[PDB]
């Protein structure tokens, strides 16, 4: 890894220290270099011992005069890449392109070093280990270094613009994958002008991504809107105002499988949520949500609520029976019993309970039949982490459906203890509604605020809570293990004692005392110590830290919610059928434009 | 003067590539394609308020001649007004003209006047 | 103290009012000075009660013409030092340097006053009584004043660099002890150039401190990186990115007992925590943590919590016994009693509880056998001082181990009442766990925030609460004295009245009422007054006072958490054996560099053109308004 890399780098410095030919090369001691060149016995095929050449050394140390003195005796090393392991295709052309020495590049081309020689080393790779990615071919190096005249010379001497890389990259791709410069826009427009012509923008990568989609997923929004400017068509100005239009053809990609919009909204990079603030896509999603999406979402949530209440009243009238046996025991109250399934299905009231139960199970199965094939399309770990997509809301509903499937199987086997999974699935189905709580404006950002907060610092409170109550509950069980439980209560054994302390930490239950009877001496001190250390001390710190956190994320949560609503929009337009979704756009074939949809827009200038 | 020579200190370090303490023509030559220190101090000498100098000196905590964001936030918390941390970075984006993440005396005095 | 200083300064002013020769030397009345010089029988060895020459007065007051007349009169006063108690060796050369007039120094050197004069005054001392300290020598004063030509002349006329004082003050050490100036650092590099020769940098003081370690504990990071300038070695540039290596030889000091790093992190001064953020050391200690320290810390935490739960389940099955006697009393509740020690160990389960107990007591003693030489080595006030060291954690665990060691003997004495120290150790053992909260990034700053908080304002709340609830509990006990206890409760006597009010403040217990039984008159008024004055007045105000302070300290807490982890690292890496750890670095002896270990690192920089353009060309909104208002 990195340690291996630095070790072999230091070994490279050892080998460059070793030979006096290479050492005088990197020192540029041209008087002694004339002696070495005068030496016939000085072998000139001697390369760097860890996979480099002498011209590579002179290119590193920029000693171009020594390079000229090298090129007569061995010009063939100018055409040679060497055999280092991270540096396997590397030529001195790449270093000369990097160090911007046009006379050196011109001298290398005077020997005729091939530009089409490509360099794909192990260090020459997109990596977190790699600090800089510059592409493979020397055109990519000329582009990212931004030397105009060098890449002009490369055009003059070859260097095809159609360049195919490992990972299918092209010059456009590595221009996108770049820390942004306005100079990069000029370089882009330059090479676009020097393109002759299908069109070169049409090619995707090896992954199958056009540079339009790459710019969309990476959000270099200056480059994005600048690339949009070529497709921008203005129509007419008058007075203060200007009517223009856009070709929304490539921005929809409705005919494609993977749309632009679902590509942009599904990304691990953050800044892409900014790129939706560009004007034509903003107007598009605004028009598109405002015309259809909000009534469909309202009626869908309404039908879900109507399902849930029928499920609830199904859960009310479970068939039950008197308890048959006798308890023979104080501290034992269990007067109820399950019915048998032959015993249950007996009445008209049971008949309507059964048809309600049928409604519940036929609403249970459609959740699976809806969403299970959607999971295989995307990565499931990618699917669950996206809070914008509501992954954690998908976590609850599948467990809900699984448990409501399981409880009927538990019924049909005459198995006891169905009340516990029923109690689970009931509260899970009721807390399921907060996904559909997204759609209102007033209701929207609040739930993703609390969803951020429950992951935020709740564990920080919880772990400390557990250890401090693990102390005090044991202390209380030791200090009450000697006397009458008929008077003290809550501290008979350790498991009721810890739950007593959990009840009484939160102040829900009042502190225990009997003022008729006597009380032991230590418990006053211990309980007062617990009260000062727990009740007011860090509970208030939770309030303060909570307020500071809400104060900080108060800006960002609305920015999140704006992306969340259009994520919901593109999801529902994916899954609904198309006769409910007519084409949004302006069919120019009506107007003789032909098979394209546009969008007209205007304002006055400021 | 001391912040002024602090500007030329890091400047001379930017010219000095090998860090030998000199500026050769080869170090000068690599600059042109991208387009001693007392020798450099003397050479830049011919090329070149009290309260503002007093204001900067209490502001720059380490005395490096360059106020960081954390030094500014520590002053901003010492001011007594609540601000988050993103707009503090915008304050650096408001003042850092050459883009070093820092402010000198000269970026400071153009802001005040 | 300073009162004595003002007194002797005033007596000095009395004597400068006294002698008219001295007073004319102050006033530079050179006509009258020629008159007094024309007086031959007058003494010219006049001297104040503090003890001076008139050359001292003229050097204080730049009266160099009178100083020349004194030097023709008595040149030997140029070689006379002071004689006072704060000023016992002070010569006029020092006043000449502190008044920095070159020609007066030239005139003093014309008579040839001794450069090596040692002026070690009581006011010439690094003291909080003293304002500005520089050390003794005239070289120190010429260095701190920044005048080269003076110290040029000093180097020309002797004035050797190798000179120490009390506390081992050399010129480099006092150049460190300064309001930090690159202006002063030019003088530093200048005097390093005038080092014309063993290595002069290798000098320790009387405390044993190299100036490298002095700058490290002082943390003048500008001076530190200038000290680091010659420590670098570049390797290659490559367009926008450049590799280099550092020498980590003096930064380790593993051969020494006093490591550099612990010397840094153990300091009274605050800003030394900033020198953790230096580009040699930061990634180094981060690498050394993330390869080593985090797994060892986690597995040590795991073994510790396993020890604690074994202690807990040992604490569960305490041997009890049926209480033989009769209570013979209502309001009397007991069932059990202590089982005797010979009666204790009778079952196989007794053997199980005994072998569980042995593990707990041997853990208790090996904690002692760990911690004892830590106290003998470092100062306990320093050892209990910093939260960075985790002082009160060590306090509470050593009280824990002391209490369990006590209560085992208390079992062996068959002394009753062992439940109280037993429960003390029981509640302290789970308070002991918070030391290990430091290791998590998601958990670390939180506990040092709360540790900062509990010292802060909890005490401020506590005293006010104590006095108000004392007075109020007495007020309720007096009015509840007159009523039958079988229906009121909580107020039989003043201790249960006090503790009942203590419960009643925090709303833990509901207020007492009987809706059948009648009730006294003024209880309504007093109880409602307490309800408004206590239950929401300062209780809710404590929340806002809490929140503002939390908001203020939440900046600093993350810095402090980043600070404490490397202290933990260097602690465990001092105490754990060397078999688990190859010493980090790069063996250049393999590479023929020889016995010095290095660190290679590279960086990619940006290329801002604007910083280059003007220099090569020369070679050819809320907070902003208030900041303007603050000026
Ligand atoms: Ca140089
Ligand atoms: Ca600074
Ligand atoms: Ca700047």
Please check if B36 is assigned to a binding site.
no
Q: Which residue of B has its CA nearest to C613?
A: B35
Please check if B49 is assigned to a binding site.
no
Nearest to C51 by CA among C93, C4, C19: C19
Q: What is the C-alpha to C-alpha distance for residues C37 and C44, in angstroms, rounded to an integer?
A: 9
Cβ contact B33–A100 (<8 Å) = yes
Nearest to C141 by CA among C118, C109, C168: C118
Cβ contact C591–A10 (<8 Å) = yes
Q: Which residue of C has its CA nearest to B48?
A: C618
Q: C-alpha angle A145/A150/A152, rounded to 5°?
A: 120
- Residues B11 and B63 grouped into a single domain: no
Q: What is the C-alpha to C-alpha distance for residues A527 and A520, in angstroms, rounded to an integer?
A: 12
Nearest to B91 among C610, C623, C628 (CB): C623
Cβ contact B30–A555 (<8 Å) = no
Nearest to C131 by CA among C86, C167, C64: C86
Per-residue burial over A575-599, b if 16 or more Cβ lie within 10 Å, else e, is eeeeeeeeebbeeeeeeeeeeebbb
Q: In sequence order, what are the residues at sequence separation of 6 or more whose Cβ sits closer than 8 angstroms to the Cβ of residue C415?
A: none
Q: What is the C-alpha to C-alpha distance for residues C344 and C320, in angstroms, rounded to an integer?
A: 9
What range does the domain containing B96 cover? Answer: 49-112
Q: In sequence order, what are the residues at sequence separation of 6 or more whose Cβ sits closer than 8 angstroms to the Cβ of residue A518?
A: C331, C332, C333
Neighbours of ion ligand 2 (CB under 5 A): B 62, 64, 68
Chains in contact with A via at least 3 Cβ–Cβ pairs below 8 Å: B, C
CA A439 vs CA A114, A509, A565: distances in Å: 61, 39, 7
Burial class (CB in 10 A: 0-12, 13-18, 19+), B34: middle
* Ligand 1 centroid distance, CA of A62 (Å): 14
Residues from chain A that touch B82, judged by Cβ atoms under 8 A, are 551
Q: What is the C-alpha to C-alpha distance for residues C78 and C92, in angstroms, rounded to an integer?
A: 7
DSSP assignment of C202-224 equals G---SS---HHHHHHHHT-HHHH
Please check if B16 is assigned to a binding site.
yes
Cβ contact A531–C430 (<8 Å) = no
Stretch 177-216 of chain C: residues touching chain A, C-beta under 8 Å: none
Q: Which residue of C has its CA nearest to B95?
A: C624
Label the pairing between strands A337-338 and A598-604. unpaired
Please write down the HEC assignment for all residues of A226-293: HHHCCCEEEEEEECCEEEEEEECHHHHCCCCCCCHHHHHHCCCCCCHHHHCCCHHHHHHHHHHHHHHH
Helix/strand number for chain A, H first, E second: 30, 5
Do the beta carbons of residue C281 and residue C251 sit within 8 Å?
yes
CA distance B22 to chain C (A): 13
Q: What is the C-alpha to C-alpha distance for residues A605 and C70, in angstroms, rounded to an integer?
A: 86
Residue A67 tokens read as: 């390079």
CA Rg value for chain A: 37
Burial class (CB in 10 A: 0-12, 13-18, 19+), B59: middle
Q: What is the CATH number of the domain that holds B36?
A: 1.10.238.10
- Residues B7 and B36 grouped into a single domain: yes
DSSP assignment of C395-462 equals HHHHHHHHHHHHHHHHHHTT-S-THHHHHHHHHHHHHGGGGGGGG-TTTHHHHHHHHHHHHHTHHHHH
Residue C297 half-sphere exposure toward CB, CA atoms < 13 A: 21
Three-state DSSP state, C336: strand
For an interface test with B, which of C220, C221, C231, C555 has the most B Cβ atoms less than 10 Å from its Cβ?
C555
Q: What is the C-alpha to C-alpha distance for residues C609 and C404, in angstroms, rounded to an integer?
A: 70
Interface residues from chain C to B (CB-CB < 8 Å): 179-183, 221-222, 229, 232, 234, 237, 271, 274, 551-552, 555, 606-613, 615-616, 618-619, 621-624, 626, 628, 630-631
Residues from chain B that touch A102, judged by Cβ atoms under 8 A, are 33
Burial class (CB in 10 A: 0-12, 13-18, 19+), A295: exposed
Q: What is the C-alpha to C-alpha distance for residues C88 and C94, in angstroms, rounded to an integer?
A: 13
Interface residues from chain B to A (CB-CB < 8 Å): 26, 29-30, 33-34, 82, 84, 86
User: Which DSSP category does C201 fall into?
Assistant: G
C585 φ/ψ sector (left φ>0, alpha ψ -120 to 50, else beta) = left
User: Which DSSP category does A77 fall into?
Assistant: G
Our measurement of the distance from residue C496's CA atom to the centroid of its chain's CA atoms, rounded to an integer in Å, reads 45
Q: What is the C-alpha to C-alpha distance for residues A95 and A98, in angstroms, rounded to an integer?
A: 5
Tracing tokens 């490096």 back to the chain, one arrives at B64
Which experimental technique did the depositors report for determining this structure? cryo-EM
- Residues B100 and B56 grouped into a single domain: yes
Q: What is the C-alpha to C-alpha distance for residues B15 and B27, in angstroms, rounded to an integer?
A: 7
Residues from chain C that touch B81, judged by Cβ atoms under 8 A, are 622-623, 626
Do the beta carbons of residue C404 and residue C364 sit within 8 Å?
yes
Percent helix, strand, coil in chain A (nearest 5)? 60, 5, 35
Residue C103 tokens read as: 């020609």
Residues from chain B that touch A552, judged by Cβ atoms under 8 A, are 84
CA distance B37 to chain A (A): 24
Per-residue burial over A114-152, b if 16 or more Cβ lie within 10 Å, else e, is ebebbbebeebeeeeeeeebbbbbbbbbbbbbebeebbe
- Residues B56 and B108 grouped into a single domain: yes
> How many of the other CB atoms lie within 10 Å of CB of C401?
21
Do the beta carbons of residue A280 and residue A599 sit within 8 Å?
yes
Q: List, in sequence order, every residue forming a beta bridge with A232; answer none if it has no partner.
A: A246
For an interface test with A, which of C418, C427, C488 has the most A Cβ atoms less than 10 Å from its Cβ?
C427
Please check if A325 is assigned to a binding site.
no
Residue A483 tokens read as: 């006397």
Q: Is C420's Cβ below 8 Å from some Cβ in A?
A: yes
Percent helix, strand, coil in chain C (nearest 5)? 60, 5, 35
Residue A228 half-sphere exposure toward CB, CA atoms < 13 A: 22
- Residues B54 and B82 grouped into a single domain: yes
Q: What is the edge-to-edge ordering of all strands in the sheet holding C598-604?
A: C232-238, C241-247, C598-604
Q: What is the C-alpha to C-alpha distance for residues A176 and A168, in angstroms, rounded to an integer?
A: 14
Residue A93 tokens read as: 């052309």
Per-residue burial over A169-185, b if 16 or more Cβ lie within 10 Å, else e, is bbbbbbbbbbeeeeebb
Do the beta carbons of residue A272 and residue A218 sit within 8 Å?
yes
Residue C523 tokens read as: 């209880």
Please write down the HEC assignment for all residues of chain B: CHHHHHHHHHHHHHHCCCCCCCCCHHHHHHHHHHCCHHHHHHHHHCCCCHHHHHHHHHHCCCCCCCCCHHHHHHHHHHHCCCCCCHHHHHHHHHHCCCCCCCCCHHHHHHHHC
Q: Is C235's Cβ below 8 Å from some Cβ in A?
A: yes
Do the beta carbons of residue C216 and residue C281 sit within 8 Å?
no
Q: List, in sequence order, every residue forming a beta bridge with A337; answer none if it has no partner.
A: A321
Helix (H) or strand (E) holding A603: strand A598-604
- Residues B26 and B65 grouped into a single domain: no
DSSP assignment of A85-152 equals SS-SS--HHHHHHHTT-HHHHHHHHHHT--TT-----SSSS--SS-S----SSHHHHHHHHT-HHHHH
- Residues B42 and B87 grouped into a single domain: no
DSSP assignment of A431-497 equals HGGGGGGGSSTTTHHHHHHHHHHHHHTHHHHHHHHHHHHHHHHHHHHHHTSSS-HHHH-S-SSHHHH
- Residues B53 and B106 grouped into a single domain: yes
- Residues B17 and B43 grouped into a single domain: yes
* Ligand 1 centroid distance, CA of A26 (Å): 15
Q: In sequence order, what are the residues at sequence separation of 6 or more whose Cβ sits closer than 8 angstroms to the Cβ of residue C501?
A: C469, C472, C473, C476
Question: What torsion, rounded to 10 degrees, do the Cα atoms B58, B59, B63, B66 define?
Answer: -160
* Ligand 1 centroid distance, CA of B92 (Å): 32
B33 φ/ψ sector (left φ>0, alpha ψ -120 to 50, else beta) = alpha
Q: Which residue of C has its CA nearest to A6?
A: C600
Cβ contact A101–B86 (<8 Å) = no
Residue C631 half-sphere exposure toward CB, CA atoms < 13 A: 21
Burial class (CB in 10 A: 0-12, 13-18, 19+), C447: buried
First to last CA, chain C: 38
Q: What is the C-alpha to C-alpha distance for residues C299 and C295, in angstroms, rounded to an integer?
A: 6
Sign of CA pseudo-dihedral C38, C43, C49, C52: positive
Residue A323 half-sphere exposure toward CB, CA atoms < 13 A: 8
Q: What is the C-alpha to C-alpha distance for residues A186 and A191, in angstroms, rounded to an integer?
A: 9
Q: In sequence order, what are the residues at sequence separation of 6 or more whose Cβ sits closer than 8 angstroms to the Cβ of residue A3?
A: none
Cβ contact B83–C221 (<8 Å) = no
Do the beta carbons of residue A150 and residue A142 sit within 8 Å?
yes
Ligand nearest to the CA of B12: 1
Given this structure, which CATH class describes domain A1-227? mainly alpha
Nearest to A101 among B33, B84, B86 (CB): B33
| Total of domains in chain B | 2
Q: In sequence order, what are the residues at sequence separation of 6 or more whose Cβ sits closer than 8 angstroms to the Cβ of residue C226?
A: C182, C185, C188, C189
């Amino acid at each position: 890894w990195e340690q291996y890399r630095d070790r072999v780098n230091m070994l490279q410095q050892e080998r460059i220290r070793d030979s006096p030919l290479l050492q005088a090369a990197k020192e540029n001691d041209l008087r002694l270099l004339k002696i070495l060149l005068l030496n016939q016995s000085c072998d000139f095929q001697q390369r760097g011992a860890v996979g480099e050449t002498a011209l590579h050394v002179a290119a590193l140390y920029d000693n171009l005069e020594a390079a000229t003195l090298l090129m007569e005796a061995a010009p063939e090393l100018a055409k040679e890449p060497a055999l280092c392991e991270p540096f396997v295709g590397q030529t001195a052309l790449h270093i000369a392109v990097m160090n911007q020495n046009l006379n050196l590049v011109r001298a290398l081309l005077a020997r005729g070093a091939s530009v089409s020689a490509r360099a794909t080393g192990a260090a020459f790779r997109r990596s977190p280990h790699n600090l800089i990615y510059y592409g493979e071919h020397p055109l990519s190096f000329a582009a990212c270094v931004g030397s105009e005249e060098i890449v002009r010379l490369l055009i003059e001497h070859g260097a095809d613009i159609r360049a195919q890389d490992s990972l299918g990259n092209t010059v456009l791709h590595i221009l996108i994958l770049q820390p942004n410069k306005t100079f990069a826009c000029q370089m882009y427009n330059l090479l676009l002008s020097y393109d002759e012509h299908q069109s070169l923008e049409l090619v995707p990568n090896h992954q199958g991504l056009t540079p339009f989609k790459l710019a969309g997923v990476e959000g270099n929004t200056v480059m994005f809107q600048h690339l949009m400017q070529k497709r921008k068509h203005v129509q007419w100005t008058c007075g203060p105002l200007t009517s223009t239009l856009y070709d929304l053809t490539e921005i929809d990609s409705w005919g494609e499988e993977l749309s632009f919009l679902e590509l942009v909204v599904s990304s691990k990079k953050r800044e892409a949520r900014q790129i939706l603030e560009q004007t034509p896509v903003k107007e598009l999603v605004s028009f598109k949500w405002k015309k259809y999406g909000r009534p469909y979402f309202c009626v869908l949530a309404s039908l879900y609520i109507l399902y849930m209440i029928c499920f609830t009243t199904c859960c009310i009238y479970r068939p039950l029976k008197l308890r048959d046996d006798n308890r023979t025991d104080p501290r034992d109250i269990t007067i109820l019993q399950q019915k048998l399934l032959q015993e249950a299905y007996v009445t008209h009231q049971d008949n309507i309970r059964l048809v309600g139960e049928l409604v519940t199970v036929t609403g249970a199965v459609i959740i699976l039949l809806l969403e299970i094939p959607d999971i295989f399309r995307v990565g499931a770990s990618r699917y669950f982490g996206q809070t914008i997509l509501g992954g954690p809301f998908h976590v609850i509903i599948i467990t809900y459906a699984s448990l409501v499937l399981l409880t009927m199987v538990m019924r049909l086997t005459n198995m006891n203890g169905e009340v516990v999974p029923l109690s689970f699935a009931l509260v899970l189905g009721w807390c399921s509604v907060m996904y559909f709580a997204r759609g209102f404006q007033m209701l929207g950002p609040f739930t993703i605020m609390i969803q951020k907060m429950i992951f935020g610092d709740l564990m920080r409170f919880c772990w400390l809570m557990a250890v401090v109550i693990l102390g005090f509950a044991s202390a209380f069980h030791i200090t009450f293990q000697t006397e009458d439980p008929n008077n003290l209560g809550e501290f008979s054994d350790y498991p009721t004692a810890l739950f007593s302390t959990f009840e009484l930490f939160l102040t829900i239950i009042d502190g225990p005392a009997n003022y008729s009877v006597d009380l032991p001496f230590m418990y006053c001190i211990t309980y007062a110590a617990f009260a000062i250390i727990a009740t007011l001390l860090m509970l208030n710190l939770f309030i303060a830290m909570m307020g500071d956190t809400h104060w900080r994320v108060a800006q960002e949560r609305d920015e999140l919610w704006r992306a969340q609503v259009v994520a919901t929009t593109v999801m529902l337009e994916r899954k609904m059928p198309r006769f409910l979704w007519p084409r949004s756009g302006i069919c120019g074939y009506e107007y003789g434009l032909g098979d394209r949809w546009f969008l007209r827009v205007e304002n006055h200038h400021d | 003067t001391e912040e002024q020579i602090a500007e030329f200190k890091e400047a001379f370090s930017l010219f000095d590539k090998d860090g030998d303490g000199t500026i050769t023509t080869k170090e000068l030559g690599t600059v042109m394609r991208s387009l001693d220190f007392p020798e450099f101090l003397t050479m830049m000498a011919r090329k070149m308020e009290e309260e503002i100098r007093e204001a900067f000196r209490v502001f720059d905590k380490d005395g490096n001649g360059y106020i960081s964001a954390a030094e500014l936030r520590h002053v901003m918390t010492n001011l007594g007004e609540k601000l988050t941390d993103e707009e503090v970075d915008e304050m650096i984006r408001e003042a850092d003209i050459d883009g070093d993440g820092q402010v000198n005396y000269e970026e400071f005095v153009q802001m005040m006047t």
